[PDB]
Design a protein around this ligand. Structure first.
Ligand SMILES: *C(=O)CCCCCCCCCCCCC
Length: 204
């Protein structure tokens, strides 16, 4: 699903503990179609046209490394204020690498946060795992979430979320090769339905 032959996302979650998951991707399924495709041009405007913009990134390639994730987030938690707010990601590969993971939080197409982490490979069960667990969510997101959950209707959450996107670029720190680039877009789910996602391939 979300992965190349060089690097596969295994698990992704954003969550709060006093554990509630806002979003969750866990990664095998028989019959399962290939991923649908979205024209990358439809979303150039969700991220900045600057350097590290989607167009420029996609221009360098390779194109099979580019995915769109639509999240229907679950923002229904509490009996709250405080809590630990975290993001956990797990990647895996057959090759030994060091990773640079850049996340760019974007509001109306403008970058308001860039977070850069590094993770070195760890051998486990005959492959390399890259575990970036319990990374503290930046304060911008935490405040944003705190406000977003006060909104009295889900349609109003959706209207606010239509201007909020995240771009993640994962590169091979040594060679500077793009390994994975994921654009994320957001709506809200009900707590009854729970969080969901749909992964697409970006093409051009
Ligand atoms: C940390 O500060 C940035 C890490 C980048 C990924 C954040 C994604 C998680 C946000 C969940 C939002 C839920 C709906 C708006």
């Amino acid at each position: 699903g979300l992965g190349t032959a060089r690097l596969q996302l295994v698990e992704f979650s954003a969550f709060v503990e006093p554990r509630h998951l806002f979003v969750h991707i866990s990664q095998p399924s028989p019959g399962a179609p290939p991923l649908e495709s979205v024209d990358v041009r439809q979303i150039y405007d969700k991220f900045p046209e600057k350097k590290g913009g989607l167009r420029e990134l996609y221009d360098r390639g390779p194109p099979h490394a580019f995915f769109l994730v639509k999240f229907w987030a679950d923002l229904n938690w509490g009996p709250s204020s405080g809590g630990f707010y975290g993001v956990s990601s797990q990647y895996e590969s057959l090759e030994h690498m060091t990773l640079t993971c850049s996340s760019k939080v974007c509001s109306f197409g403008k970058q308001v946060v860039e977070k850069v982490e590094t993770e070195r490979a760890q051998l486990e069960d005959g492959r390399f795992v890259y575990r970036l667990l319990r990374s503290p969510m930046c304060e911008y997101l935490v405040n944003f979430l705190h406000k977003l959950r006060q909104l009295p209707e889900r349609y109003m959450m959706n209207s606010v979320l239509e201007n909020f996107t995240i771009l993640q670029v994962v590169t091979n720190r040594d060679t500077q090769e793009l390994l994975l680039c994921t654009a994320y877009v957001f709506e809200v789910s009900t707590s009854e339905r729970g969080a969901q996602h749909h992964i697409y391939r970006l093409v051009r």
